[PDB]
RNA sequence: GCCGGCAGUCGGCAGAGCGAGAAAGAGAGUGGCGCGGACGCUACGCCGCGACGAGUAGGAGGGCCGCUGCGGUGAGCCUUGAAGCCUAGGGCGCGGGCCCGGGUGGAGCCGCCGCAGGUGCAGAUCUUGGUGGUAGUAGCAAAUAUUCAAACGAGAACUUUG
RNA sequence: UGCGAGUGCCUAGUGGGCCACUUUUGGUAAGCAGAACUGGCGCUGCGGGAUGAACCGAACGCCGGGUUAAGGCGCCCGAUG
RNA sequence: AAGAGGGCGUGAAACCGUUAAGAGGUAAACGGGUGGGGUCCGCGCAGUCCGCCCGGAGGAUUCAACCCGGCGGCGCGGUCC
């Protein structure tokens, strides 16, 4: 068992695959980050059948199912112990998340403090 | 190429004005230079008025 | 598909004032509630006029207020203005007044109080008349700006009296071919 | 603030907001007010009439100091003096008629625009208008010149 | 888009409503035991209906998209490990991109409110620098010619001697 | 019969077009040149015409079910096996 | 700390060498949809708790109501000073 969310709806996503920039497979200098094709004769731009899909507003997730983990919590970045007590009224639907720049000496103090306030930490054993 | 109701402007920028641009960053330093010489002028003539005759 | 022209789908009326000040937004906050709760249409016009721009709510001269408040029927009556109250130097006598505005100039403020008048603000207006009963709503000259004299029909067009865009007024900069019967033609 | 400029939103668009068929060349129409009579004649005719040609006589050494003549109307006449001057009028059973020196404030000619309140005055100015006099004389005042 | 709704959380100082076919008030008067009631409202916020959603040149709006530096701000992070880089790890956002886990690294760095710009690349027979296929390929062919034995050496078709 | 209307400022881009039912000029004719109305491509994806500018249907936020237009139902290829 | 070894702070990509896995006659690569195989993750593998009431088993120097002292809110005290 662990710290369960207050409510656990069925998280549904209209598209789970990432959006791939055109011709990023052929070349190396073209990154995975999306760029809108603005050419005059482009198969992607005028939406030819059997091509890659362009990101539109219709691919947006439901407002109720947005920004949760598969566990059902929202992330919130945490730097020190003083920023952990703000989530004392949101532990049933929000989880604490430790930054990459937190040293292992005071990372243990945040974890055991979060146990006392019953706040879920998505990375409870990172540096050990 | 004027378009849709501007004034017929005559800018006097057809010369090479960029060689003769006079910047005024000397203004606060010139004010101190004039003032510090004004106080020094008034101290050489001790009983005489600072403005002059 | 549906054949609907979408070019006029979005109305271009104002929703929120563009100013970032907090006193105007508190006045908007006060009159937002009164517009959608009370049945008085006076509060809707004030809320609509509290969203205008500075060139959209022109200053109201003091003498126009005197001229518009000496009409029969409006005695013991308050005047509410959305713009600003400015003094007029070509008026001598000023009666007792009751004026409500966002801002009154210092010269016009001392003139009203000297004659026994009363200058109120819009927050005190809601405490006095939340429905705006017994109020007269006035506004300044919308077309009184110098900008509107350059509008309308273009110059160099017959029977048009638009001021041209001229850098400085002189004898030889204009009033020549295009304006004179002696020089080519005139309109 | 370059971050609010239109150029930041145009990053990515090939033509940069200046057309695809006709590119933004150097000077398509000509530099400055090129072609007042040719190929830009319609814009100069229906927006700046009377731009071309001579009119009137030429005055070579024209000095603005000779033609200096600031004007003031009768409607803004009691603002030239203090408030306690005019309230000490139409009183004391004398007809005090205070003297307002127009030249003293920095105006020369007095014009007749506006309505004058009923109080006889004495006005000292270098110039006067015909319609200026009949308003003051109609009220009951008198005009006195000065050089 | 709605003259959209929500300041009404008006609680032993209380009575918890104004979806309801019909222009207006769950209005004041005067004669005949048990201390109790979930959420909220960054009103630049929250919530409810209806309609619609293509797009070149082009225009407008929103970016809690991103880079650099500055004024504040986080009793901010950091040699018990900062920036940078890699990653078949976990993920988030439609998307710009962003947050963690592991490895290298050793010294500075990040969020928010505003400010400023030399601020975002796939091309320009672009500039600089580096690296591939071609490819162990074309080639090492103008002027007749080298051979034998010994010496030096670790090593001799090319050096030396006969 | 249906639709909430009027009005004022700036303002980019455009100023090489093309095709088709019908009318029609020159030309023997032309995927030729030049006109009128309307609709399309330009700027537009989708089903169909094997293939495709302009042909027929039909115009597009992301999906599930159902039903069709034009086309089709021997196999490729869903459907008259 | 040479996983800092004299052009030596880190050491990216293009490119190449080697190892592990997989595949290979319609050039390669891509989108939608699945399936299979991997490396890791959920430190999973008798499966979440939160309040009220009921039953029997145990423990405090404890509940309500009173006394004193201190603090705080309100007071149209109809109209205290």
Curated annotation (Swiss-Prot), chain A:
Pfam families linked: Ribosomal_L32e
Presence of the UniProt keyword Ribosomal protein in the record: yes
GO biological process: translation
Modified residues (Phosphoserine): 61
Crosslink (Glycyl lysine isopeptide (Lys-Gly) (interchain with G-Cter in SUMO2)) position: 8
InterPro entries assigned: Ribosomal_eL32 (IPR001515), Ribosomal_eL32_CS (IPR018263), Ribosomal_eL32_sf (IPR036351)
GO cellular component entries: cytosolic large ribosomal subunit
Keyword RNA-binding: no
Subcellular location: Cytoplasm
A GO term for molecular function: structural constituent of ribosome
Keywords, sorted A to Z: Cytoplasm, Isopeptide bond, Phosphoprotein, Ribonucleoprotein, Ribosomal protein, Ubl conjugation
PROSITE patterns named in the record: RIBOSOMAL_L32E
Entry-annotated residues carrying N6-succinyllysine: 49
Record text on subunit structure and interactions: Component of the large ribosomal subunit.
Function in brief: Component of the large ribosomal subunit. The ribosome is a large ribonucleoprotein complex responsible for the synthesis of proteins in the cell.
Family affiliation: Belongs to the eukaryotic ribosomal protein eL32 family.
Protein name, UniProt field: Large ribosomal subunit protein eL32
Gene, per the UniProt record: RPL32
UniProtKB/Swiss-Prot annotation, chain B:
UniProt modified residues of type N6-acetyllysine: 15
Cellular localization per UniProt: Cytoplasm
Quaternary structure annotation from Swiss-Prot or TrEMBL: Component of the 60S large ribosomal subunit (LSU).
Entry's family note: Belongs to the eukaryotic ribosomal protein eL13 family.
Annotated function: Component of the ribosome, a large ribonucleoprotein complex responsible for the synthesis of proteins in the cell. The small ribosomal subunit (SSU) binds messenger RNAs (mRNAs) and translates the encoded message by selecting cognate aminoacyl-transfer RNA (tRNA) molecules. The large subunit (LSU) contains the ribosomal catalytic site termed the peptidyl transferase center (PTC), which catalyzes the formation of peptide bonds, thereby polymerizing the amino acids delivered by tRNAs into a polypeptide chain.
Name by which UniProt lists this protein: Large ribosomal subunit protein eL13
Taxonomic lineage of the native organism: Eukaryota, Metazoa, Chordata, Craniata, Vertebrata
Gene name in the database record: RPL13
From Swiss-Prot, chain D:
Signal peptide annotation: none
Modified residues (N6-acetyllysine): 46, 54, 109
Keywords annotated in UniProt: Acetylation, Cytoplasm, Hydroxylation, Phosphoprotein, Ribonucleoprotein, Ribosomal protein
Single GO MF descriptor: structural constituent of ribosome
UniProt feature, compositional bias: Basic residues: 1-29
Entries under PANTHER family matching the protein: 60S RIBOSOMAL PROTEIN L27A, LARGE RIBOSOMAL SUBUNIT PROTEIN UL15
Protein name per its UniProtKB record: Large ribosomal subunit protein uL15
Lineage, highest ranks first: Eukaryota, Metazoa, Chordata, Craniata, Vertebrata
């Amino acid at each position: 068992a662990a710290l369960r969310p207050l409510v656990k709806p069925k998280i549904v996503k209209k598209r789970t695959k990432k959006f791939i920039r055109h011709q990023s497979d052929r070349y190396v200098k073209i990154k995975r980050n999306w760029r809108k094709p603005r050419g005059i004769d482009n198969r992607v731009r005028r939406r030819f059948k059997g091509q890659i899909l362009m990101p539109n507003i219709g691919y947006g997730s439901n407002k109720k199912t947005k920004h949760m983990l598969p566990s059902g919590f929202r992330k919130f970045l945490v730097h020190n112990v003083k920023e952990l007590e703000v989530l004392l009224m949101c532990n049933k639907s929000y989880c604490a998340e430790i930054a990459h720049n937190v040293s292992s000496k005071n990372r243990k103090a945040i974890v055991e403090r979060a146990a006392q306030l019953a706040i879920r930490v998505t990375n409870p054993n990172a540096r050990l | 190429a004027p378009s849709r109701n501007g004034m017929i402007l005559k800018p006097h920028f057809h010369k090479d004005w960029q060689r003769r641009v006079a910047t005024w960053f000397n203004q606060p330093a010139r004010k101190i230079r004039r003032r510090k010489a004004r106080q020094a002028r008034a101290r050489r003539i001790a009983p005489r008025p600072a403005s002059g005759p | 598909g549906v054949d609907i022209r979408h070019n006029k789908d979005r109305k271009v009326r104002r929703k929120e004032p563009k100013s970032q000040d907090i006193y105007l937004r508190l006045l908007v906050k006060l009159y937002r509630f009164l517009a959608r709760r009370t049945n008085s249409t006076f509060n809707q016009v004030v809320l609509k006029r509290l969203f205008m721009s500075r060139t959209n709510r022109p200053p109201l001269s003091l003498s126009r207020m005197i001229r518009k408040m000496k009409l029969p029927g409006r005695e013991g009556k308050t005047a509410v203005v959305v713009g600003t109250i400015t003094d007029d130097v070509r008026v001598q006598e000023v009666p007792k007044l009751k004026v409500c505005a966002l801002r009154v100039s210092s010269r016009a403020r001392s003139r009203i109080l000297k004659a026994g008048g009363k200058i109120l603000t819009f927050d005190q207006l809601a405490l006095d008349s939340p429905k705006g009963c017994g109020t007269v709503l006035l506004s300044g000259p919308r077309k009184g700006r110098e900008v509107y004299r350059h509008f309308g029909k273009a110059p160099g067009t017959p029977h048009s009296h638009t001021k041209p865009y001229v850098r400085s007024k002189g004898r030889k900069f204009e009033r020549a071919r295009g304006r004179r019967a002696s020089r080519g033609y005139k309109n | 603030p370059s971050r609010l400029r239109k150029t930041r939103k145009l990053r990515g668009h090939v033509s940069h907001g200046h057309g695809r068929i006709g590119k933004h060349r150097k000077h398509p129409g000509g530099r400055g007010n090129a072609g007042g009579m040719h190929h830009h004649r319609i814009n100069f005719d229906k927006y700046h009439p009377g731009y071309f040609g001579k009119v009137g006589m030429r005055h070579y050494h024209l000095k603005r100091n000779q033609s200096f003549c600031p004007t003031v109307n009768l409607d803004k006449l009691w603002t030239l003096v203090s408030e306690q001057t005019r309230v000490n009028a139409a009183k004391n059973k004398t007809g005090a008629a205070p003297i307002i020196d127009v030249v003293r404030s920095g105006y020369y000619k007095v014009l007749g625009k506006g309505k004058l309140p009923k109080q006889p005055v004495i006005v000292k100015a270098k110039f006067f208008s015909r319609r200026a006099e009949e308003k003051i004389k109609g009220v009951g005042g008198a005009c006195v010149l000065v050089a």
